[PDB]
Amino acid sequence: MAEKAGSTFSHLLVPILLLIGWIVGCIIMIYVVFS
Structure with missing residues (x-):
C-alpha cells in the first residue's frame, strides 16, 4: 500500500497485535483446560 516503512509497519502492526493476542489466549x- 505505502512504500513508506513507517506506514508499512503500522499497517502490519495492527494485525500483528491481533494475531499475537489470539496465540496468547490459546x-x-x-493451561486452564489442562487443570
Whole structure:
C-alpha cells in the first residue's frame, strides 16, 4: 500500500497485535483446560 516503512509497519502492526493476542489466549486456555 505505502512504500513508506513507517506506514508499512503500522499497517502490519495492527494485525500483528491481533494475531499475537489470539496465540496468547490459546496458550492460556490450554493451561486452564489442562487443570
